[PDB]
Amino acid sequence: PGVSVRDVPAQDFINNYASFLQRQGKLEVPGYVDIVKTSAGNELPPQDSEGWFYKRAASVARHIYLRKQVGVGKLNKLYGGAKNRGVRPHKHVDASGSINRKVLQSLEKLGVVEISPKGGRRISDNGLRDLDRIAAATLEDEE
Amino acid sequence: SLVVQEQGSFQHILRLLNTNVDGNINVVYALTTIRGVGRRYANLVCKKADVDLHKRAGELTQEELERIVQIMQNPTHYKIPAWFLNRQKDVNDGKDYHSLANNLESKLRDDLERLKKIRSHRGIRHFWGLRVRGQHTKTTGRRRA
Amino acid sequence: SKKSHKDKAKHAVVLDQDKFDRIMKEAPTYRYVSVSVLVDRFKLGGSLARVALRHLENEGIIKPVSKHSKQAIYTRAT
Amino acid sequence: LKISTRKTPNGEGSKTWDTYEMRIHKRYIDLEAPAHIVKRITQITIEPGVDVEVIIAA
Amino acid sequence: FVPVELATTIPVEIQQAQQEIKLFNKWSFEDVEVKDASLVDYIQISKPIYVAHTAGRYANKRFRKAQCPIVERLTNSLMMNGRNNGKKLKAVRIVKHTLEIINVLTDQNPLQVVVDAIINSGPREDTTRVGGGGAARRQAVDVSPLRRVNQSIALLTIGAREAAFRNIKTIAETLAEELINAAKGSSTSYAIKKKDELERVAKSNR
Amino acid sequence: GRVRTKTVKRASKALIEKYYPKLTMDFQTNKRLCDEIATIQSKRLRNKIAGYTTHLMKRIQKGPVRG
Amino acid sequence: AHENVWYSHPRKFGKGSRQCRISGSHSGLIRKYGLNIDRQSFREKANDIGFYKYR
Amino acid sequence: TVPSVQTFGKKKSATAVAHVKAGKGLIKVNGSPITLVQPEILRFKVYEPLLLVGLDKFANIDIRVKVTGGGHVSQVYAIRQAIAKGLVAYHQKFVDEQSKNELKKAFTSYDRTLLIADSRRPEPKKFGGRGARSRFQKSYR
Amino acid sequence: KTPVTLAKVIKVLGRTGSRGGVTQVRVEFLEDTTRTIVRNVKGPVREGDILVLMESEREARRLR
RNA sequence: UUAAUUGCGAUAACGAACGAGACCUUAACCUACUAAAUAGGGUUGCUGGCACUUGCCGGUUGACUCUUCUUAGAGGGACUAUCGGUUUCAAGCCGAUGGAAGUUUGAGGCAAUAACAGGUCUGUGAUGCCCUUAGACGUUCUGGGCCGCACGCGCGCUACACUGACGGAGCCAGCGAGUACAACCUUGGCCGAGAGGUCUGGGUAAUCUUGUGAAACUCCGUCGUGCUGGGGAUAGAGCAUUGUAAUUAUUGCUCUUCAACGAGGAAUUCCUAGUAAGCGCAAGUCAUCAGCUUGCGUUGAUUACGUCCCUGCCCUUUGUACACACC
Ligand SMILES: [Mg+2]
Ligand SMILES: [Mg+2]
Ligand SMILES: [Mg+2]
Ligand SMILES: [Mg+2]
Ligand SMILES: [Mg+2]
Ligand SMILES: [Mg+2]
Ligand SMILES: [Mg+2]
Ligand SMILES: [Mg+2]
Ligand SMILES: [Mg+2]
Ligand SMILES: [Mg+2]
Ligand SMILES: [Mg+2]
Ligand SMILES: [Mg+2]
Ligand SMILES: [Mg+2]
Ligand SMILES: [Mg+2]
Ligand SMILES: [Mg+2]
Ligand SMILES: [Mg+2]
Ligand SMILES: [Mg+2]
Ligand SMILES: [Mg+2]
Ligand SMILES: [Mg+2]
Ligand SMILES: [Mg+2]
């Protein structure tokens, strides 16, 4: 029967959506990738030098599908963990804002994310349709 | 998945910018062993040079070394930003450089002797060998060794 | 700031052909295979321990019992 | 409404603190009701301590 | 075996014959018995559990500690250092990995290996401080079976810990080695070595 | 460490000495009797008083007792 | 006491910008909910204010 | 109307509200099927009522659980207790007495918390120490 | 040899020792249940345990 | 016997008073009551998608209805209740069962007589006396210091790594607080790599920040026993924020050098269940600044359930050449 993103494991669905977005030539990566920490909390760029932006976009799209609507600051709160503040106690450091802004604009160009009246951005019918389609892809991929 | 790695060509020692570097370490962390180059800067230099990140420094070829070397002396040519550079705005001539193994320590020494000569409080504190950035010294750094 | 251990390189940072015939020869007859077990015999550095360990899942040389991260649990194929 | 305070006015003594507090209870009510009787209700039956406030919201 | 149809499809292996509760759906609590008669009723393999993780009030009364599942007690004693003190899911994962590893080496259903190692590595005679200061010695006494279980678990986990410390082998593998070696009387095991030395010392101070 | 200090013991003693025909063996009925025939300020003290009253009533039922 | 110099230093913020409202002191001040009463006078007048020891 | 009731299960600060209806064997938590509980190693904890009772007991019964508050494992235990209590309450309300009593015998003979909420809750902290019932340190010199 | 014997406690004679952490019990053998000893235990015991003894001639003496 | 000068009692003692207890706050349990667009749920609308069977996961401040969870009022509930042991058979203790709860149910708040030459005149326009009261020890302004550094000691923080570091992905709380005669909490949209900047919009508060999408934690990979990708101190350069003003680095961010540190002697500190410990968040300091404190919650144990051996405390008996009382 029909299948939503809630019926598929998070990590596998996100990996498959990243792979599918990477395979097709859409979802342009900003020219400043390979450069950025992705947050003040981190101290190195992603280990996967190329393709990590697709993973982040997949995670963002799944997050907007699951939740009500999400802006950029909320994603900054979501991503980013604890900064090793040298010899001081760790705290919570918000993620980089430019990366998430570019992710949301790229998702807008792909048509998967729509601007919501209540502020932030919500899921769009076409994009959520592709999300269910690739959730089915992963689910019948499992067995 | 795995390769025999062509016995008889894998280098074990290298001399990049007149410092001996062991080549068996990962490329970025092997480059980290030269003064003025850290894991972040070496990682970015390796990324821009298109050499494999997970490769071993003792197994990449010679023109790879010279291309990496060329990238990491004039970074601004290869789209390394104005920031992320070691010494930016360069208060001798205003051109953002990046100091290296001998150059880093040497130029730090000229900056130190400039601060000594200028008779700044920071300079005389450096000349004395005391803490500079304004930390308490009643209990901090009470042992030379 | 000590010097007590006095450890050598003690690890094949790069695999060699004779070491390849080795890893393949006792790819069986090692009734339990893991990263630490593989490097215990001085023939693997530890990063390529995972490389050769994942490579053996090619023609069913060994079987997986659990594939959780941070380690691996493999038995000889029977 | 809570405030923690050190008891010693001079810092001397074993570290001892205290917590003063009140509670505020609100209990709002809204009425789909006529005009004059509602207002007359608001201007009657007032007790010191409890504070009454009225919003028309019409 | 009779896969029940539902709108939610639980995996078949989770549905097969589940009146046969297994520890990690892999090891059977039946076929596991305590060789020693003294330490029975202080090893809790009798009850079945689907996870080595239960929020049980095993520290309210005096002797409920025995009724805690023995594997659960091993998990609780693994999570012992300041750097890793509250982490118990990690301890459960480590114990699970140890159980599969022990299954690999000498199949000998790993719960039986755990029980046998606990039986062997527990001292039977110990010492107490009795010396009156100037004439201070040790004094030979006997140990409670509950303290035998406690001490065996303690040295097993300590040996695994200092075997894993700054070492290539994982904590699960070191724990599996210690459990396997303590299943027999192999003196290479740290826990059995401490047991033997402590019993010898108690013999020397009758 | 439950010892049932002066107040509950004395109140239960007076309760028995003035209301034995109405007291019963059950805790709940005697609790209601304690509520209605005596003005105990709080309710924890009421429960303690009723409990000791029931205990003394059971002791009396077993046989005659001092005091 | 030239008006240009007397009390010329800004006092928009900091330790001495606000006082105790009881004693005029600048030490041990309680700014919570706009009390602006120092701690000792707060301990004295809490019951009158509405604050009580409860737990 | 469809025979359906609502129960709940709590942990330290977790709370799972479970609606049980006469469905088709449909068990979802937070809109996701039970097989994908937030963690992974306490998954069997949340299957535990399923396997203790037997799935065929509730094959035409659907489960919807919303779990909020508390950390991961507290939430998991909350779903555990919520599902168990929902099954028991539904069987009491609409099925039969002996069925509910048999469910309670199967449950309470195993991890009593399955039907009874845990009594332990955190101890308030006190001045003079960084912990709820610990002191800071002494100097003596 | 290995003359390991077992002994089930029938009663516990309080807790002794300068530390106050050891106890004294009256154990009766699994065999010949009319033959008993008094023995010192270092750990939590109650009526029902089965101590393991490498000796049998020993009798407990109060630790001071 | 009790945690208790708590009781059973015996009695030149009888009746009493303060303390303890009782009492309040708080944490549990309430499918029992009252109710709720400032909290949630169901049915049904109006829709989105996937399935095609009527079903699943969603959106709407459209309607009807309900209070299980969320709230807060009146109340209920536990009183060691029942039973079995043990007790001059009395106070009471131990165990099991039913319970939500059986340590005084957990945690606290008040908390007696007598006293210290204990601290505070530096909190008070509380204050006696003494001092000063004009180039002032009053008040204000500028700049410096309270942070120096051959050294010792006390709270702590980060660490010495594999139960780990680093990458991604998962995504979980409860205490709070928040702008007016001032300029607070900040969502959202654009910029910047980040700190941050800008434009708008909410919130004088269960409405908005906020479901504070917090860390530890979990899954998959890189690393591989190398003072190493641990550790991040000490410095060099640059970019911003608060501030009249930041040098003697306020603080945040970017690149680099990366030191000591190998589980730490004598000795010594805290702690028996949601406890210790790990992990962070909020509030008080606050124009900016915590490694502090007060609270809160997450993950969550080992080992007791005893003793007077060390350090002390309570009662009684005894001795004293002690009473500024074994200093
Ligand atoms: Mg993250
Ligand atoms: Mg991580
Ligand atoms: Mg760290
Ligand atoms: Mg930490
Ligand atoms: Mg703590
Ligand atoms: Mg209700
Ligand atoms: Mg009785
Ligand atoms: Mg109390
Ligand atoms: Mg004066
Ligand atoms: Mg003055
Ligand atoms: Mg000072
Ligand atoms: Mg202190
Ligand atoms: Mg590091
Ligand atoms: Mg919350
Ligand atoms: Mg987070
Ligand atoms: Mg290093
Ligand atoms: Mg302070
Ligand atoms: Mg005690
Ligand atoms: Mg005299
Ligand atoms: Mg003397």
Side-chain angles (χ1 to χ4, degrees), chain A, chain B residues 1-4 6-145, chain C residues 1 9 11-78, chain D, chain E, chain F, chain G, chain H, chain I residues 2-64:
Chain A
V3 51
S4 288
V5 192
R6 285 185 223 266
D7 293 18
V8 62
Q11 173 174 328
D12 253 358
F13 168 94
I14 291 175
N15 256 264
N16 287 354
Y17 201 68
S19 86
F20 160 66
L21 259 56
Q22 163 154 0
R23 263 193 289 97
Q24 75 174 358
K26 330 192 61 61
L27 181 92
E28 87 304 15
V29 291
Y32 75 59
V33 300
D34 161 350
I35 284 312
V36 182
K37 275 192 162 94
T38 88
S39 94
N42 331 91
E43 53 155 293
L44 269 88
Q47 274 281 32
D48 160 276
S49 63
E50 71 305 349
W52 72 263
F53 188 90
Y54 302 88
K55 271 213 200 71
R56 171 74 70 113
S59 81
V60 170
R62 176 186 193 268
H63 206 269
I64 324 190
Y65 176 90
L66 295 186
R67 313 312 151 86
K68 201 79 188 52
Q69 67 287 357
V70 175
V72 188
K74 287 278 303 170
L75 282 206
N76 292 288
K77 195 147 139 217
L78 172 67
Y79 306 95
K83 172 164 210 292
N84 173 271
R85 307 211 284 125
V87 76
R88 294 201 281 300
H90 310 58
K91 324 163 61 63
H92 165 46
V93 182
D94 295 60
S96 73
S98 63
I99 273 184
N100 301 49
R101 254 194 298 109
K102 293 311 168 48
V103 152
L104 274 297
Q105 309 188 319
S106 293
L107 266 58
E108 171 36 33
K109 290 182 185 179
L110 268 281
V112 305
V113 163
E114 151 188 340
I115 308 307
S116 63
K118 285 349 176 179
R121 303 169 207 252
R122 55 173 165 171
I123 211 52
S124 67
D125 73 327
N126 272 16
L128 77 82
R129 172 193 301 108
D130 325 287
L131 261 53
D132 311 359
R133 264 222 287 281
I134 182 164
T138 291
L139 181 67
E140 285 62 20
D141 190 328
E142 193 43 56
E143 45 177 53
Chain B
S1 46
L2 86 173
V3 290
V4 180
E6 152 36 47
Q7 57 210 328
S9 91
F10 169 78
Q11 216 79 43
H12 265 271
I13 201 45
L14 312 167
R15 189 147 178 77
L16 279 308
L17 304 97
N18 74 357
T19 88
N20 286 16
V21 48
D22 162 31
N24 64 46
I25 314 127
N26 179 18
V27 177
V28 287
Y29 303 100
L31 300 179
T32 325
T33 88
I34 177 166
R35 281 213 58 174
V37 165
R39 54 180 60 89
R40 182 68 192 281
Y41 180 62
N43 186 7
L44 184 79
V45 167
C46 155
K47 270 149 170 42
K48 287 293 190 170
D50 268 31
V51 63
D52 187 293
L53 269 295
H54 311 81
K55 207 201 214 283
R56 297 295 162 90
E59 97 186 353
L60 58 93
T61 84
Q62 159 96 340
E63 102 299 20
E64 295 315 61
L65 330 171
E66 49 206 291
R67 203 166 75 249
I68 271 169
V69 154
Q70 213 53 70
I71 277 182
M72 61 66 58
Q73 282 155 260
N74 183 317
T76 190
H77 271 47
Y78 313 80
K79 294 332 171 203
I80 279 176
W83 62 278
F84 184 110
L85 289 174
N86 158 285
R87 175 176 256 281
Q88 321 181 10
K89 291 324 193 47
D90 188 352
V91 279
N92 160 234
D93 55 75
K95 286 185 66 37
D96 42 355
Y97 292 164
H98 195 114
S99 35
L100 272 309
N102 203 357
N103 308 354
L104 166 75
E105 67 84 12
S106 60
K107 175 163 211 330
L108 187 133
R109 217 169 59 260
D110 320 69
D111 177 323
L112 261 287
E113 61 76 13
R114 177 262 295 249
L115 291 156
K116 173 219 175 75
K117 184 167 71 68
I118 180 64
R119 288 286 152 204
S120 174
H121 160 269
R122 172 190 238 167
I124 48 138
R125 208 76 168 279
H126 269 287
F127 160 72
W128 276 326
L130 313 181
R131 294 285 187 276
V132 164
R133 285 159 197 269
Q135 305 103 16
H136 299 52
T137 324
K138 188 189 304 190
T139 37
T140 309
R142 51 180 48 254
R143 183 32 59 223
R144 310 185 311 99
Chain C
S1 64
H11 284 287
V13 64
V14 285
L15 154 55
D16 200 291
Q17 183 77 259
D18 36 7
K19 277 174 196 164
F20 195 8
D21 325 290
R22 265 292 318 259
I23 304 149
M24 272 300 345
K25 274 312 321 173
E26 316 58 21
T29 39
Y30 267 126
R31 74 165 312 296
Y32 162 69
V33 152
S34 74
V35 284
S36 79
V37 163
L38 280 165
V39 288
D40 203 331
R41 309 317 168 95
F42 257 100
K43 29 164 198 178
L44 296 67
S47 58
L48 59 91
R50 282 182 309 287
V51 152
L53 199 174
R54 190 158 28 77
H55 149 68
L56 259 54
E57 269 336 279
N58 52 346
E59 286 100 16
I61 309 168
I62 39 181
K63 275 133 182 167
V65 201
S66 81
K67 50 184 76 52
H68 181 279
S69 54
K70 299 283 269 207
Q71 78 155 185
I73 284 153
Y74 293 126
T75 175
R76 193 178 31 262
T78 58
Chain D
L1 265 280
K2 177 182 91 60
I3 284 88
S4 166
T5 308
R6 206 146 188 289
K7 264 173 183 189
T8 84
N10 44 307
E12 192 285 340
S14 40
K15 274 66 187 148
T16 278
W17 300 68
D18 65 5
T19 63
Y20 306 93
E21 47 174 61
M22 52 211 67
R23 293 145 270 281
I24 307 137
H25 325 263
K26 293 192 58 189
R27 326 269 206 92
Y28 74 79
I29 295 100
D30 50 39
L31 292 214
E32 200 73 28
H36 42 57
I37 44 174
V38 154
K39 289 168 275 284
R40 204 191 71 280
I41 282 155
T42 88
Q43 302 94 230
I44 68 179
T45 83
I46 295 104
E47 194 23 74
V50 57
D51 167 315
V52 152
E53 184 165 286
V54 60
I55 306 303
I56 42 160
Chain E
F1 187 76
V2 190
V4 184
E5 68 148 28
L6 304 103
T8 315
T9 49
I10 294 96
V12 188
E13 51 285 30
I14 311 196
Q15 291 187 169
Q16 194 179 357
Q18 298 315 299
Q19 290 70 7
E20 71 78 21
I21 296 166
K22 273 183 190 104
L23 176 49
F24 280 120
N25 220 54
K26 265 207 144 167
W27 330 118
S28 73
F29 285 154
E30 60 81 13
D31 159 358
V32 190
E33 70 155 29
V34 190
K35 305 304 179 177
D36 193 307
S38 56
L39 301 148
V40 76
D41 267 24
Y42 292 152
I43 282 171
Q44 219 290 291
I45 75 196
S46 46
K47 284 298 292 179
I49 50 167
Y50 273 139
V51 196
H53 182 308
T54 313
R57 292 145 67 56
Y58 292 140
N60 219 5
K61 301 295 292 302
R62 169 150 201 246
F63 266 109
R64 325 182 62 81
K65 287 167 61 104
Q67 303 214 250
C68 179
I70 182 68
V71 52
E72 179 147 281
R73 271 162 62 73
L74 190 73
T75 64
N76 286 34
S77 165
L78 271 183
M79 45 178 332
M80 175 145 307
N81 273 127
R83 84 209 214 190
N84 47 1
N85 205 288
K87 317 160 195 171
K88 190 166 161 300
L89 297 157
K90 184 160 299 169
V92 176
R93 174 65 57 184
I94 292 159
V95 163
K96 172 171 184 167
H97 285 345
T98 296
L99 292 179
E100 270 75 349
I101 291 156
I102 284 173
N103 183 25
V104 175
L105 281 38
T106 76
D107 63 308
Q108 311 244 340
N109 169 23
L111 305 174
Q112 190 68 38
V113 168
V114 152
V115 168
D116 194 8
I118 279 169
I119 302 304
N120 295 290
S121 100
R124 286 98 72 195
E125 100 188 359
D126 202 353
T127 70
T128 181
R129 293 280 320 308
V130 76
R137 306 88 39 78
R138 294 229 43 70
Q139 192 46 21
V141 294
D142 306 329
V143 283
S144 158
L146 184 57
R147 195 190 174 68
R148 296 196 58 227
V149 171
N150 299 325
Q151 198 91 359
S152 34
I153 283 175
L155 294 324
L156 289 160
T157 62
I158 297 314
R161 211 160 281 129
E162 42 175 49
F165 198 80
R166 51 162 75 89
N167 192 250
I168 310 288
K169 308 205 78 221
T170 61
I171 188 43
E173 272 189 318
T174 49
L175 183 53
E177 264 171 46
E178 186 67 342
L179 292 200
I180 287 300
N181 294 134
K184 51 209 172 207
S186 169
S187 76
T188 54
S189 164
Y190 164 90
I192 210 71
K193 167 193 307 308
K194 285 286 182 290
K195 197 270 298 175
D196 188 6
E197 158 276 356
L198 179 68
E199 284 188 353
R200 164 157 57 68
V201 157
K203 164 161 277 192
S204 325
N205 278 170
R206 293 284 154 82
Chain F
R2 45 207 72 246
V3 196
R4 290 197 221 82
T5 89
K6 290 123 154 163
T7 56
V8 47
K9 287 200 173 58
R10 301 146 78 76
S12 75
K13 280 186 38 199
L15 277 187
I16 284 201
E17 99 167 8
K18 294 171 196 41
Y19 282 91
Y20 193 98
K22 309 303 181 178
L23 301 193
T24 89
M25 276 295 100
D26 163 78
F27 167 70
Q28 320 279 353
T29 55
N30 293 340
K31 176 165 71 179
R32 301 298 184 216
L33 266 308
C34 291
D35 268 1
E36 182 295 339
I37 89 170
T39 65
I40 308 85
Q41 287 292 319
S42 63
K43 102 191 299 193
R44 179 157 191 251
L45 189 68
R46 192 270 326 255
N47 300 336
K48 278 171 173 278
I49 274 189
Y52 203 60
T53 313
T54 52
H55 185 59
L56 284 178
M57 281 295 318
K58 278 168 80 193
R59 270 167 67 183
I60 287 289
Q61 158 85 331
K62 199 59 67 66
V65 77
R66 291 199 294 187
Chain G
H2 203 299
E3 172 66 340
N4 283 11
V5 317
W6 173 273
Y7 215 103
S8 90
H9 202 60
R11 273 164 176 80
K12 272 157 277 304
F13 51 51
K15 294 282 321 173
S17 165
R18 62 271 189 190
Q19 328 186 19
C20 155
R21 187 214 269 243
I22 281 315
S23 286
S25 67
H26 306 130
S27 42
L29 190 34
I30 281 197
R31 274 137 61 72
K32 201 143 143 170
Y33 323 115
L35 266 191
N36 293 77
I37 315 165
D38 64 343
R39 47 172 175 121
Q40 307 98 338
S41 324
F42 172 54
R43 273 189 38 77
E44 280 186 30
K45 314 322 281 293
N47 287 255
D48 283 273
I49 286 174
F51 282 110
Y52 300 81
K53 263 205 177 36
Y54 263 132
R55 163 191 73 82
Chain H
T1 47
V2 187
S4 300
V5 309
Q6 323 148 38
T7 85
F8 72 104
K10 315 168 88 84
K11 201 43 171 105
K12 285 183 288 191
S13 54
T15 305
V17 177
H19 309 279
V20 295
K21 318 191 288 184
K24 267 81 63 192
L26 162 45
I27 298 84
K28 311 285 277 295
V29 304
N30 263 16
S32 170
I34 165 177
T35 319
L36 300 323
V37 72
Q38 230 312 109
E40 172 253 333
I41 213 164
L42 295 191
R43 212 165 287 173
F44 269 110
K45 286 307 286 169
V46 86
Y47 305 100
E48 272 206 90
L50 303 189
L51 330 170
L52 282 197
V53 175
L55 319 90
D56 55 355
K57 187 73 77 178
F58 49 106
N60 63 307
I61 311 306
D62 72 7
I63 282 316
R64 283 196 183 85
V65 174
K66 156 167 104 181
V67 68
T68 89
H72 303 311
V73 308
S74 33
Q75 293 224 80
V76 168
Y77 278 91
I79 328 178
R80 281 171 75 262
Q81 181 188 151
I83 292 168
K85 198 174 306 168
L87 192 32
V88 168
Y90 181 20
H91 268 242
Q92 180 270 314
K93 194 56 167 153
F94 298 139
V95 177
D96 165 288
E97 284 298 320
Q98 283 64 0
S99 44
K100 164 211 77 71
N101 290 109
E102 191 56 351
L103 308 165
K104 294 179 65 23
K105 295 299 186 310
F107 279 140
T108 53
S109 66
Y110 187 117
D111 183 339
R112 164 161 150 271
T113 80
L114 268 202
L115 271 43
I116 289 330
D118 198 327
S119 46
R120 313 181 329 180
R121 303 261 311 281
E123 213 219 331
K125 200 190 77 70
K126 311 153 191 50
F127 52 85
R130 59 212 50 267
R133 194 161 101 211
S134 174
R135 315 266 56 75
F136 283 123
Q137 182 133 350
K138 310 288 279 300
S139 64
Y140 281 12
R141 264 172 239 291
Chain I
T2 314
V4 175
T5 181
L6 314 189
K8 173 166 125 55
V9 297
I10 213 55
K11 196 217 318 179
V12 47
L13 302 182
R15 309 197 87 244
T16 166
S18 39
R19 313 269 46 94
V22 308
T23 167
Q24 205 163 60
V25 295
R26 179 182 312 286
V27 305
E28 71 86 10
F29 283 71
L30 286 194
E31 312 86 300
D32 57 18
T33 74
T34 79
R35 156 197 176 76
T36 79
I37 328 185
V38 81
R39 288 301 291 261
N40 292 317
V41 199
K42 174 212 171 263
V45 280
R46 73 176 178 285
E47 311 214 324
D49 299 66
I50 297 155
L51 289 63
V52 167
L53 327 170
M54 323 219 175
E55 293 88 319
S56 275
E57 326 90 294
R58 174 74 64 60
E59 245 158 45
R61 204 181 151 61
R62 335 280 172 82
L63 296 182
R64 270 93 66 90

